[PDB]
Structure formats: structure tokens, C-alpha cells
Amino acid sequence: CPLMVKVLDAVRGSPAINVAMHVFRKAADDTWEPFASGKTSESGELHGLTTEEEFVEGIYKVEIDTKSYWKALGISPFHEHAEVVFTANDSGPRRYTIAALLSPYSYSTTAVVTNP
Amino acid sequence: CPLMVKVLDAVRGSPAINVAMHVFRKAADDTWEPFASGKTSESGELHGLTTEEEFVEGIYKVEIDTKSYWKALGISPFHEHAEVVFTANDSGPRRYTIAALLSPYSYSTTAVVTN
Amino acid sequence: CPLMVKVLDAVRGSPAINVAMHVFRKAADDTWEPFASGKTSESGELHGLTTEEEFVEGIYKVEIDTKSYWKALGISPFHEHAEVVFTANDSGPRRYTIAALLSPYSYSTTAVVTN
Amino acid sequence: CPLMVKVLDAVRGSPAINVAMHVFRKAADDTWEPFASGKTSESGELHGLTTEEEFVEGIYKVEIDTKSYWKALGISPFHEHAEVVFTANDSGPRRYTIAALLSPYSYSTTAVVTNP
Numbered sequence: 336c337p338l339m340v341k342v343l344d345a346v347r348g349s350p351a352i353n354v355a356m357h358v359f360r361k362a363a364d365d366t367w368e369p370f371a372s373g374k375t376s377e378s379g380e381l382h383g384l385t386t387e388e389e390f391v392e393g394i395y396k397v398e399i400d401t402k403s404y405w406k407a408l409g410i411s412p413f414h415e416h417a418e419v420v421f422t423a424n425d426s427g428p429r430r431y432t433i434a435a436l437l438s439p440y441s442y443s444t445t446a447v448v449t450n451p
Numbered sequence: 452c453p454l455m456v457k458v459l460d461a462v463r464g465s466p467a468i469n470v471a472m473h474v475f476r477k478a479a480d481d482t483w484e485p486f487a488s489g490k491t492s493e494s495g496e497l498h499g500l501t502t503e504e505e506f507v508e509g510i511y512k513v514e515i516d517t518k519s520y521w522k523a524l525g526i527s528p529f530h531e532h533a534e535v536v537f538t539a540n541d542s543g544p545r546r547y548t549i550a551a552l553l554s555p556y557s558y559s560t561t562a563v564v565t566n
Numbered sequence: 567c568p569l570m571v572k573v574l575d576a577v578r579g580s581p582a583i584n585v586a587m588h589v590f591r592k593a594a595d596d597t598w599e600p601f602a603s604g605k606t607s608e609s610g611e612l613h614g615l616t617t618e619e620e621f622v623e624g625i626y627k628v629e630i631d632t633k634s635y636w637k638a639l640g641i642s643p644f645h646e647h648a649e650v651v652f653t654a655n656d657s658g659p660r661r662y663t664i665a666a667l668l669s670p671y672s673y674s675t676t677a678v679v680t681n
Numbered sequence: 682c683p684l685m686v687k688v689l690d691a692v693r694g695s696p697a698i699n700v701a702m703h704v705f706r707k708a709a710d711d712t713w714e715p716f717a718s719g720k721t722s723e724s725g726e727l728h729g730l731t732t733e734e735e736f737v738e739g740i741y742k743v744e745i746d747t748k749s750y751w752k753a754l755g756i757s758p759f760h761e762h763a764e765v766v767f768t769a770n771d772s773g774p775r776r777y778t779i780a781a782l783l784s785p786y787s788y789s790t791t792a793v794v795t796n797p
């Protein structure tokens with residue numbers, strides 16, 4: 336599992352459950368090609384987006400639909416979504432853990448990249 | 452000043468100086484039209500992006516070239532850039548301050564929306 | 567102004583106004599002696615804490631009463647307070663800006679150290 | 682495992698390994714009593730600080746020795762340490778995950794509190 340995403344709610348102190356996200360990969364012609372998508376589980380995690388074979392070198396974008404999440408909780412947040420854009424696997428294969436911590440007017444995102 | 456951006460450097464405890472960014476507005480065909488751009492000053496701020504007449508409701512994206520900034524300092528960054536995408540003015544003009552705090556493998560962005 | 571504190575509210579996208587804090591300095595018997603205190607203004611800043619003569623090298627703690635702030639807004643917070651503990655002036659006076667960003671179950675604090 | 686701490690380095694994009702921390706509990710007489718201590722593992726985690734029996738209701742403080750960590754990496758950081766002070770178990774037993782994300786001049790800390 337070379338790409339995993341973990342989302343936390345900073346207002347309730349819990350995993351952010353059922354957060355949708357779409358992953359794109361930049362194609363040869365400079366457009367974003369749809370790569371994978373899913374929702375966070377009850378542990379605030381999304382596993383199985385991809386595999387070591389399919390997760391080739393390139394520039395990827397993960398767009399976390401944070402606004403629907405806040406909206407379903409009765410909150411109007413600032414952001415339309417949270418986006419993480421990064422070059423992956425450029426020095427060979429890595430495992431990427433992307434973590435997003437959400438507040439209605441703020442978010443942060445961090446990557447842990449481990450050599451496996 | 453209806454839209455201000457402030458960037459900070461969590462590795463050095465300083466403003467992030469000379470950081471380039473573009474601002475786009477969502478156009479009705481759903482693409483991103485360039486709107487305003489600049490570099491951060493020595494206080495890590497970028498002002499004068501727009502005015503209140505021109506800054507109408509809509510979806511705006513600020514794309515901060517964080518990767519060039521880490522490269523000039525000689526430190527491998529993770530992100531290509533930091534994006535902030537938001538709906539402005541939901542019901543009327545407020546002032547927006549967007550602050551980004553940068554680390555090579557992490558960033559946070561916050562909005563302060565005042566009256 | 568050698569030491570300034572700024573607090574922000576990530577739930578509401580505003581300054582955190584009226585937030586109380588005390589500043590302590592580490593005394594040679596290793597206890598924490600009160601040094602300065604205040605509340606944030608309407609811009610979420612607290613200035614005038616000390617002056618450059620009085621603000622000598624040493625270990626300082628800023629203890630931000632974040633729990634009272636969340637209680638007045640009616641939202642259960644996790645932390646008792648936020649603490650920022652740092653060695654000042656390692657080699658000479660610099661200006662310090664300590665910014666705290668508050669959420670009920672999270673906070674971040676950053677220092678901007680300038681010349 | 683009612684209390685777990687996870688520390689990440691935001692400069693290298695990795696777990697923060699071998700970070701020491703001490704946990705105190707506030708005693709009846711308003712002093713901090715030593716409660717537990719340990720170091721983060723290779724996954725940046727510290728498990729086994731306590732047990733459900735010993736982890737009674739009270740105000741706890743976790744002091745993460747972030748400065749030694751930065752120092753061992755050749756960096757002079759701002760903070761002496763990162764401290765998390767909180768009331769635990771006041772509405773009955775909970776599981777607390779405390780996460781700290783470290784940069785030399787900044788850190789954040791978040792708690793996830795789950796009912797078990």
C-alpha cells in the first residue's frame with residue numbers, strides 16, 4: 336500500500352469519517368488524469384488507492400473534499416477542498432502517508448515518506 | 452485591501468520572503484483564469500492583489516510556489532506548491548487574510564475573515 | 567516591542583479576542599516566576615509585554631488560557647491551556663512574535679524571530 | 682492502550698524517532714507527580730505508557746523533549762519542548778491519541794479521543 340490518506344477533525348477531536356477524495360496524475364499533455372478515488376473509513380483512513388505497479392513516477396494531486404464534510408456537520412467552512420500536489424517515486428518507489436488535519440478555517444497537510 | 456497573503460517559514464522562524472504566487476478566479480467554463488500575482492515582501496506579506504470593486508463573489512485559488520522557495524534554500528520539499536481554494540464573499544465583502552506556514556514536508560493555511 | 571503574541575481562531579476564521587495569558591521567566595531555583603501578562607486585543611494581538619532592557623536571556627513560558635476562550639464560545643476544548651516554552655536571546659536581542667492557532671482539539675504555535 | 686503519542690518530523694517527512702517524553706499527573710496538592718515516560722519507536726510512536734486501571738481521572742501533562750531531538754539533528758530549535766496539558770477521563774474512560782508534528786520553529790499537537 337504505497338499511498339494512504341488519513342484525515343482528522345480538529346473540532347471534535349476525532350477521525351474525519353466519510354471524507355471523499357479524488358486522486359489525479361498529470362498526463363504527458365499537462366492535463367490531470369483521474370487516478371483513483373475513495374472515502375475515509377471510520378478510522379479516518381483511506382487505504383488501497385493504488386498498487387506499487389500502477390503508482391508510477393509522476394506528479395499527483397489529491398483533492399480532499401473538506402467542504403462537504405464540514406457542510407454535513409452544519410458548518411460553512413472557508414476552503415473548497417484541501418489539495419496535496421506532489422512528485423512521487425522520482426528516486427524510485429516510496430510509501431506515502433498523507434495526513435490532513437481539518438478545521439473550518441484552517442487545515443494542514445503533512446507527508447511521511449518511507450523507503451519500502 | 453480586501454485580500455492579503457502572509458507566508459511563514461517554520462524551519463527558520465522567519466517570514467518567507469520572495470515567495471511567488473498566482474491568484475486565479477473560477478471562470479463559468481470551469482477553468483482557472485489568472486487574476487493577480489506577486490512575491491512576498493520582506494515581512495512575508497503580499498498586499499495590493501486586488502481592490503474591492505474587482506473582488507467580486509466567486510471561487511478563487513491562490514497557488515503558492517512553495518517548491519521554488521525550498522529549492523533556493525537548498526532543502527528538498529515534498530509539495531509542488533500550496534493551493535488555497537475558497538469561495539469569496541458568500542454574502543458581501545469581508546477582508547481576507549490567508550496565512551500559510553511552510554515546512555519542507557508540511558504546510559498549514561488559515562484564513563482570517565474580518566469586517 | 568521585543569515580544570509579541572498573536573492568537574487565531576481556526577473554528578471562526580477570526581482573531582482570538584480577549585484571550586488571557588501569563589508570561590513567566592525561569593528563576594535559578596528552577597521554578598517559574600510570573601513576569602508579564604495580558605489579554606489579546608481585537609486584532610488578536612498582545613503587545614507591550616516587556617521592553618528590551620528587562621527582556622534578558624533566559625527561559626520563558628507563555629501560558630495561553632485557551633480553555634477559558636473555548637468555554638466562552640461554548641465549545642468543549644481538549645487542552646487546559648497552550649504553553650510556549652523557549653530560550654530567549656541565545657546570542658543577543660531579536661524581536662519575537664509567537665503566533666498560536668487554536669482549534670478545540672488542536673493548536674499550533676510558531677515563532678517568527680527577526681532582526 | 683488508553684494513551685498513545687505519535688510524533689512526526691515535518692522537515693524530513695518522517696516519523697520522529699527516539700523522542701523522549703515524560704508524563705505527569707496533577708496531585709491533590711497542586712504539584713505535578715511523575716506518571717510515566719518513554720521514547721518514540723521507529724514508527725514515531727509511544728505505546729504502553731499506562732493502563733486503563735492506572736489512568737484515572739485527572740489533569741495530565743505530556744512534555745515532549747523536542748529540543749534534544751532537533752539538537753541531535755544539528756538544529757537549534759525555538760522551543761524547549763512541546764507540552765500537552767489536558768483533563769482525562771472526566772466523563773468516564775476514553776482512549777487518547779496525542780499527535781505532535783515538529784518543525785524547528787513551530788509545532789502543532791492534536792488529540793483524537795475515542796470512546797472505548
Ligand SMILES: COc1c(O)cc2oc3cc4c(c(O)c3c(=O)c2c1CC=C(C)C)CCC(C)(C)O4
Pocket residue numbers: 457459548550551552559560561562563572574609663664665666667674675676677678
Ligand atoms: C503560522 O503562525 C503564524 C505566524 O507565525 C504569524 C501570523 O501572522 C498573522 C498576521 C495577521 C493575520 C494572521 O492570520 C496571521 C497569522 O495567521 C499568522 C500565523 C498563523 C498562520 C498559520 C498557522 C498558517 C491576521 C491578522 C492580521 C492583523 C490581518 O495579520
Ligand SMILES: COc1c(O)cc2oc3cc4c(c(O)c3c(=O)c2c1CC=C(C)C)CCC(C)(C)O4
Pocket residue numbers: 341343378432433434435436443444445446447687689778779780781782789790791792793
Ligand atoms: C501531523 O500529520 C500527521 C501524520 O503525518 C500522521 C498522523 O498519524 C496518526 C495516526 C493515528 C491518529 C492520529 O491522530 C494521527 C495523527 O494525528 C497524524 C498526523 C497529524 C498530527 C498533527 C497535525 C500534530 C489517530 C488515530 C489512530 C488510529 C490512533 O492513529
